[PDB]
């Protein structure tokens, strides 16, 4: 998931925004 | 904005900044 | 509580939170 | 010691509490 | 003072502390 | 540069001070 992707690879702020309430 | 490499607590700091008053869910794989 | 993997400054942040007003000693091996 | 154990392996908050004053 | 091993955001935290009100430039290689 | 040196090797606070304004 996002936690793993950001750490093993890279992620964007736009991808992170999907986890906001 | 630029792409990020974020592990551990650094990811949660990023979520806090992106989401602000909206809040967020932190959901690691187990 | 859960087990932790803590390196560098992250360990000191954890000690600060656990110990609060008690304070703590940080004593790395040299 | 604790500094090394938490980083090379894992440690608990209960182990950390032993370093409080 | 002691030598430092500083990666990612930890470097910027260090620059903030060293430079204070002087400010600083953060200039990574690309 | 400094960003890379501090992370791949080690750096001193005196080296960092050169990046203050
Ligand atoms: Zn870190």
Swiss-Prot record, chains A, D, F:
Superkingdom of origin:
Eukaryota
Section of the entire sequence shown:
90 to 110 of 110
Organism listed in the record: Homo sapiens (Human)
From the record, give the cysteines joined by S-S bonds. 6-11
Protein's UniProt name: Insulin A chain
């Amino acid at each position: 998931g996002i936690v793993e992707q950001c750490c093993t690879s890279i992620c964007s702020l736009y991808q992170l925004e999907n986890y906001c309430n | 904005f630029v792409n990020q490499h974020l592990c551990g607590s650094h990811l949660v700091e990023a979520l806090y900044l992106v989401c602000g008053e909206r809040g967020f869910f932190y959901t690691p794989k187990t």
